[PDB]
Amino acid sequence: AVTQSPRNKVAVTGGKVTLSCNQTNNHNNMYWYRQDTGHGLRLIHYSYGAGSTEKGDIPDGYKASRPSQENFSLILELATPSQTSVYFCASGDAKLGVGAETLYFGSGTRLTVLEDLNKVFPPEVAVFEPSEAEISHTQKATLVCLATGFFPDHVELSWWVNGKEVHSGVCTDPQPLKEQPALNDSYALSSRLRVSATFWQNPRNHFRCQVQFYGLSENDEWTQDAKPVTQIVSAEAWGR
Amino acid sequence: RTHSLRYFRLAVSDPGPVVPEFISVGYVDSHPITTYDSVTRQKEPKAPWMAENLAPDHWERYTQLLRGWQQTFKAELRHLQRHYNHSGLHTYQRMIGCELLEDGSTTGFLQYAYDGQDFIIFNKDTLSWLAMDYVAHITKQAWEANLHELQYQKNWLEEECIAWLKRFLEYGRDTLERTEHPVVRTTRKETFTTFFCRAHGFYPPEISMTWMKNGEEIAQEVDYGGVLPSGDGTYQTWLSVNLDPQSVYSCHVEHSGRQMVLEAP
Amino acid sequence: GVEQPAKLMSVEGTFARVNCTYSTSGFNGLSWYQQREGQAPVFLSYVVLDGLKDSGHFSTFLSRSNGYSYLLLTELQIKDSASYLCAVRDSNYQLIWGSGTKLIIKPNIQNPDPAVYQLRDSKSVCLFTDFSQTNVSQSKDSDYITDKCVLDMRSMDFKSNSAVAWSNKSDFACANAFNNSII
Amino acid sequence: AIQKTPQIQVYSRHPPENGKPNILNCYVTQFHPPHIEIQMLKNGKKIPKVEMSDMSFSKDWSFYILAHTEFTPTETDTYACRVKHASMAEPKTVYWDRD
Ligand SMILES: *[C@@H](C)/C=N/c1c(NC[C@@H](O)[C@@H](O)[C@@H](O)CO)[nH]c(=O)[nH]c1=O
Numbered sequence: 001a002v003t004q005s006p007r008n009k010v011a012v013t014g015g016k017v018t019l020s021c022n023q024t025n026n027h028n029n030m031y032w033y034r035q036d037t038g039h040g041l042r043l044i045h046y047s048y049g050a051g052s053t054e055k056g057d058i059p060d061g062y063k064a065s066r067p068s069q070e071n072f073s074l075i076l077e078l079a080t081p082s083q084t085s086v087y088f089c090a091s092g093d094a095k096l097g098v099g100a101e102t103l104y105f106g107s108g109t110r111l112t113v114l115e116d117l118n119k120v121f122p123p124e125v126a127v128f129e130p131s132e133a134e135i136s137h138t139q140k141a142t143l144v145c146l147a148t149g150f151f152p153d154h155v156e157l158s159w160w161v162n163g164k165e166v167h168s169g170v171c172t173d174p175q176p177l178k179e180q181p182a183l184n185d186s187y188a189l190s191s192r193l194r195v196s197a198t199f200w201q202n203p204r205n206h207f208r209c210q211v212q213f214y215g216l217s218e219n220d221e222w223t224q225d226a227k228p229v230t231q232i233v234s235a236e237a238w239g240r
Numbered sequence: 241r242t243h244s245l246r247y248f249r250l251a252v253s254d255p256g257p258v259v260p261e262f263i264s265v266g267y268v269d270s271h272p273i274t275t276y277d278s279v280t281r282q283k284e285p286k287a288p289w290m291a292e293n294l295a296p297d298h299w300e301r302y303t304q305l306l307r308g309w310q311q312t313f314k315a316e317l318r319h320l321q322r323h324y325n326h327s328g329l330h331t332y333q334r335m336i337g338c339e340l341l342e343d344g345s346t347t348g349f350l351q352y353a354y355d356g357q358d359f360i361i362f363n364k365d366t367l368s369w370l371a372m373d374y375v376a377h378i379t380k381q382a383w384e385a386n387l388h389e390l391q392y393q394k395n396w397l398e399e400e401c402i403a404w405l406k407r408f409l410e411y412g413r414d415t416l417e418r419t420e421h422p423v424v425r426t427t428r429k430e431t432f433t434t435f436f437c438r439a440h441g442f443y444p445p446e447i448s449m450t451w452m453k454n455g456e457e458i459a460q461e462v463d464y465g466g467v468l469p470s471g472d473g474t475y476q477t478w479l480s481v482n483l484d485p486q487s488v489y490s491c492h493v494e495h496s497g498r499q500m501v502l503e504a505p
Numbered sequence: 506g507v508e509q510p511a512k513l514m515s516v517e518g519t520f521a522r523v524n525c526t527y528s529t530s531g532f533n534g535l536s537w538y539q540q541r542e543g544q545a546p547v548f549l550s551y552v553v554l555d556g557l558k559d560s561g562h563f564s565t566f567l568s569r570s571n572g573y574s575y576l577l578l579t580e581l582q583i584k585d586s587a588s589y590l591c592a593v594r595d596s597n598y599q600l601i602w603g604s605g606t607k608l609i610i611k612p613n614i615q616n617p618d619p620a621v622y623q624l625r626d627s628k629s630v631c632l633f634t635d636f637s638q639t640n641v642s643q644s645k646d647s648d649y650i651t652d653k654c655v656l657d658m659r660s661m662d663f664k665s666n667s668a669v670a671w672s673n674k675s676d677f678a679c680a681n682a683f684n685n686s687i688i
Numbered sequence: 689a690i691q692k693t694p695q696i697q698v699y700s701r702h703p704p705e706n707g708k709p710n711i712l713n714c715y716v717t718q719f720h721p722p723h724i725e726i727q728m729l730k731n732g733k734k735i736p737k738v739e740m741s742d743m744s745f746s747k748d749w750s751f752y753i754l755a756h757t758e759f760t761p762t763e764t765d766t767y768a769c770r771v772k773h774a775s776m777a778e779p780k781t782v783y784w785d786r787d
Contacts, residue, residue, distance in 0.1 A: 040605060048305075048308035133622050137622075142634060177651065194656050258743075286742075331720070333745075335747070356690040356691075356749050356750070400596065440701075469713075470701040472701065
């Protein structure tokens with residue numbers, strides 16, 4: 001229905017960031033919100049039709065344009081760290097009056113504006129084998145994967161057992177703990193996978209912890225030493 | 241007494257001169273307060289007591305809504321002309337508003353019109369739309385398919401609309417409750433004799449004129465001209481009585497507590 | 506303009522009413538949205554007249570004069586643990602968004618076996634599994650404690666409360682009596 | 689589709705006085721469709737200072753407009769108000785009467 005591009009972005013202070021939105025629902029109204037911890041959803045710019053563009057509650061430092069009916073891009077001419085937020089694009093049918101409007105939100109866009117891109121670190125995945133005390137006691141393995149030392153938190157952990165993305169016994173931490181609370185803090189995230197010991201006894205069961213990291217795009221500058229670009233890091237595991 | 245707030249909308253399929261494609265004008269007690277049309281693309285106050293009490297934010301948000309509502313309203317005219325297989329010039333009109341009567345009993349109305357004739361009428365008590373032709377029936381079933389809207393309509397027509405009106409009447413109470421007394425004179429137009437009793441320049445458009453025969457007899461063979469507007473915000477009226485050379489006529493005029501009796505030669 | 510709680514707790518399989526109290530100038534509607542962690546808000550219910558909207562697996566009440574509405578969520582499961590947003594429409598048609606209430610659902614465990622295991626690394630993390638009233642706390646020195654998590658092994662009726670604590674060396678141990686200290 | 693014949697009413701804003709300046713009105717009402725042409729006349733010629741009010745709405749789905757030109761009445765000069773509307777195949781002219 002409603003999609004957003006780019007899904008994640010890591011910009012520098014004083015850069016050009018264009019967050020575009022596209023809709024399939026034939027709606028004349030499209031919006032741009034930002035969700036921050038203390039405040040609720042706050043409007044930035046909206047549009048009631050192709051070409052028309054109006055201001056919202058926070059138009060400071062933000063520009064928007066609706067080239068076609070289906071597209072309403074949010075332009076950040078001069079990027080600044082105070083614009084780091086998760087942005088949401090919405091839609092609404094203008095035929096249902098102006099009061100009964102049901103906003104159809106697109107998925108988030110995690111934007112992070114940094115002073116120096118040298119702080120962008122990719123994660124390090126470590127997969128831990130179960131305990132024999134668990135198998136003798138619970139008869140369920142409860143494996144654990146740790147992804148430590150990544151910044152920003154634009155990551156997504158996923159388990160891939162024998163080529164299939166399992167979602168049964170997976171409870172990944174929803175919020176990644178900061179390594180130490182000092183501004184850019186190189187968060188780490190944990191996740192647990194709890195399979196039956198029989199699934200662990202067979203040495204043919206292949207276990208893996210995949211962490212997708214959304215970092216610097218290829219159209220960046222990393223002339224110093226590493227290139228922490230968008231990559232997938234995983235650590236494998238086998239049964240015993 | 242009674243007070244009302246109405247918002248009309250017009251859509252024509254031929255934006256000719258002196259008639260824009262989309263017009264929307266609000267009225268309070270038959271007095272223009274607001275205006276919008278596709279030529280200006282901006283909501284503006286039609287009364288000075290509207291521009292002084294409504295902050296510049298109220299003239300910036302409702303413009304955006306009207307700009308969106310303009311696209312919707314012109315779209316609905318196209319959709320109807322398809323159902324009727326109509327081409328050329330056609331009118332799509334809308335009336336919405338409430339009126340606050342004396343004794344507190346409020347009402348709420350919302351109805352559409354196509355080519356001057358009623359098209360569909362909303363019932364805030366039954367939460368349903370009334371259709372006049374089969375095309376209006378297809379509209380009814382589509383509009384009655386989003387209960388979020390019908391319930392929204394009832395709230396505005398009953399709660400929200402009155403709050404605006406009470407707010408609006410307090411604004412320009414000096415103008416809406418003004419009192420200007422008439423200039424009443426009597427003339428003589430003989431047959432090819434008819435006496436005329438004319439009043440001029442009264443703002444409260446409720447004035448009584450009764451032409452009295454002898455000392456006490458209401459002349460029943462009289463003619464009446466309505467309270468025509470003048471242009472300066474005042475009104476005017478006249479009344480005639482075909483006389484006969486009898487061996488005494490007097491015009492009785494009362495307006496806002498000023499009663500005046502006039503001769504008649 | 507719109508005020509809302511920030512937290513709510515209720516047992517799995519029971520209900521939870523989430524409140525909303527607006528102070529807008531006018532009122533044209535009240536809409537509830539569900540936003541769940543990384544996902545985006547999903548419309549739930551819209552209410553503009555006074556009364557209760559029996560939508561089935563949930564309900565919505567509105568009091569116009571009091572300026573108050575609550576969402577009654579029933580037959581709760583784990584997937585329903587999210588944040589709930591109420592937005593009200595201004596007299597000039599502006600959505601005033603609330604701060605959102607984070608509803609957390611307690612996983613009812615039929616066999617609480619509080620046991621802390623030590624996972625070998627193939628680095629020794631510590632797992633605190635099978636502990637609802639057992640509240641965990643991020644604790645101690647600079648060197649890491651996580652919070653409770655619910656995994657629903659769909660093969661069986663298993664739903665275990667797990668937690669993982671690790672430290673950068675420091676010669677810590679899984680048997681280190683933590684501040685939670687459920688014992 | 690549906691056309692309602694307009695109602696032309698020519699009068700003066702103030703009591704007429706032959707020699708004293710005044711203003712002559714033309715109050716056209718109860719007409720639909722809203723497209724209309726109004727011309728005021730003086731002894732046959734077209735008065736070029738006709739000022740028209742903004743078109744107003746009515747509860748009965750008709751429209752009304754007030755057209756007015758400043759003038760100076762005499763005992764000989766005649767005035768009228770010509771209106772052209774789709775409800776009529778020819779323009780209708782109404783002359784002013786003072787009495
Ligand atoms: C600004 C004062 C102009 N308002 C205006 C309106 N206002 C009423 C409108 O809010 C309701 O009709 C709507 O909520 C119900 O759908 N209506 C109108 O038709 N034209 C106007 O200019």
